[PDB]
Design a protein around this ligand. Structure first.
Ligand SMILES: OCc1cc(Br)ccn1
Ligand SMILES: [Cl-]
Length: 130
């Protein structure tokens, strides 16, 4: 229905705003763009499902997210990719891991504070009906 299209629209507007707020945080700059093969030619080798905040915007705009749960799976991927690609005790890896945990924690905290649970539940029920 048009009401369901309106619901998904509101979801996309909400997800673009959360994503923008993460992307403008200087801590999260490394997560804003895909990894350039030049700097890191072994990246695409190790990480089978690369994800970054520019790709998340593109996915929102392509109507790939019908629930906040599905969006959070991609935020979780940005985090777990960074924990897997950068697992060493050296400070460069520890700094990326801490920034990746912080992204994930920040996205969850904004959603806890600003997503209405009944809005999510509605999205989940429209998705499950499709
Ligand atoms: O969980 C991430 C995701 C990817 C696609 Br494609 C659609 C929905 N959710
Ligand atoms: Cl830095």
């Amino acid at each position: 229905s048009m009401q369901e299209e309106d619901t998904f629209r509101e979801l996309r507007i909400f997800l673009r705003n959360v994503t923008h707020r993460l992307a403008i945080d200087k801590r999260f700059r490394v997560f804003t763009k895909p990894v350039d093969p030049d700097e890191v030619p072994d990246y695409v080798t190790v990480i089978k499902q690369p994800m970054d905040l520019s790709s998340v915007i593109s996915k929102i705009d392509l109507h790939k997210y019908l629930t906040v749960k599905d969006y959070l799976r991609d935020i979780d991927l940005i985090c777990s990719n960074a924990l897997e690609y950068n697992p060493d005790r050296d400070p460069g890896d520890r700094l990326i891991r801490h920034r990746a945990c912080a992204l994930r924690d920040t996205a969850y905290a904004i959603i806890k504070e600003e997503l209405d649970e009944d809005f999510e539940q509605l999205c989940e029920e429209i998705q499950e009906s499709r």
